[PDB]
Structure formats: structure tokens, C-alpha cells
Ligand binder design. Structure first.
Ligand SMILES: CC[C@H](Cc1ccccc1)c1cc(O)c([C@H](c2cccc(NC(=O)CCNC(=O)OC(C)(C)C)c2)C2C=C2)c(=O)o1
Lengths: 99, 99
């Protein structure tokens, strides 16, 4: 995959045996998913976007397959507008910005 | 350039005479720059992100030099915490996201 930005960089992620859609976001440091049920213990987090801060739950060493690419790492679950794959997951699947 | 996302994807941009640092961010449909002065007329607008919505003043057909390359298009000016170059000019500079 080589993706252009004429349209939202949307992918299908598989987390929990579920297909969800997420935006590829390079502006995003962490991966933020909408509310859902993940395994294990969480910690608390406050990330700040364009509209202010939200507080999320941090989950570690979570398995997420993103466009058939398997990443394992930190996911943050909270009141976001959409599912964001951040730079934290972009680098594990070998993502590059190019121009 | 091929850029890696281990570090935040920051670029220097030249807009309305001034050099600024902005974040290349493919999660953003629109380029939103922190409060500055743009010549011409502007239409009020509210765009959301993580955190909620912010009020912006949309100037149209602003010329900008992101890493040398000149893009034309709409810049919004508001209390964005960081200057954000979104999909609307990225495309213009032949930015692609590859993995
Ligand atoms: C600036 C960093 C922060 C996210 C972050 C920061 C630190 C660590 C992790 C994540 C951040 C990045 C991002 O790309 C966004 C995104 C964003 C950024 C700039 C502008 C917009 N709005 C637009 O482009 C126009 C309207 N789009 C829109 O409403 O989209 C949604 C998804 C809300 C429906 C939206 C957001 C939609 C997800 C943001 O809100 O906040």
C-alpha cells in the first residue's frame, strides 16, 4: 500500500475479532479508539486534541492487525470522534510520509 | 522526502511572509494554523477534533510553502494548540502515506 490524501486515510483494523475502521493519523502520537472492551488492567491518561483534553484509559501490549499488518502495543480508549492509529502503531507497520 | 514517524512529522512552512513550524497530519482534513493575521476576508466556521469543536476564521486561497513546495488552499485560523497542515494541502504537495 501506497495511499493518497484526496480522501480520508481510512483502514480496517482487526482488534478483538472485530472489524473496525480507523483513520491513519501522523499528527497523532498515540492510537485512540472509541469506547470498547479490552482485556487486562488500564491506567489513566489525558491526551489533548484540537478541542481540548479528554481523559482516556490506557491499555498495554494490545494486539491490533491493521490492514493485515500485526502491531502490538498501546491503545487508548475514549471519547474520540473516530478511531485514530497514531505514530505509535504507524512505526511498527513501517509507515512513511512521502512527498 | 521520505519521512519516518518515530519523531513528530514537523515541517517549516512560509505563510504570509513568515516561517512557521507545522505538523503534517493526515488525520486532519483541513489546515488549521494558530492565531495569526491573514489578509483578506474570512468566513466563521466551527471544526471539531479530539476534545470537541473550535471556532475558526476561514481564509480561502492562501499560498503556502511547506518544505519548498507551494500549495494553494484554505487555511483556518483559530486557537489550535499546534499549527496543522491537513489533507487539503498535503495532496497538493504529492504527499502519500506508504507501508
Ligand atoms: C493535534 C494532536 C491531536 C491528537 C493526538 C495528540 C497527541 C497524542 C495523541 C493524539 C489531534 C490530531 C488530529 O489529527 C486531530 C483530528 C483533526 C485535526 C484537525 C482538524 C480536524 N477537523 C477537520 O479536519 C474538519 C472536520 N472533521 C471532522 O469533524 O472529523 C471528525 C472525525 C471529528 C468527524 C480534525 C481529529 C479528527 C480526529 C485532532 O483532533 O487532534
Amino acid at each position: 500500500p501506497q495511499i493518497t490524501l484526496w480522501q480520508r486515510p481510512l483502514v480496517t483494523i482487526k482488534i478483538g475479532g472485530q472489524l473496525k475502521e480507523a483513520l491513519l493519523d501522523t499528527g497523532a502520537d498515540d492510537t485512540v479508539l472509541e469506547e470498547m472492551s479490552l482485556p487486562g488492567r488500564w491506567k489513566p491518561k489525558m491526551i489533548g486534541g484540537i478541542g481540548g483534553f479528554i481523559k482516556v484509559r490506557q491499555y498495554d501490549q494490545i494486539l491490533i492487525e491493521i490492514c493485515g499488518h500485526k502491531a502490538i502495543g498501546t491503545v487508548l480508549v475514549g471519547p474520540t470522534p473516530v478511531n485514530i492509529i497514531g505514530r505509535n502503531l504507524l512505526t511498527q507497520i513501517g509507515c512513511t510520509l512521502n512527498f
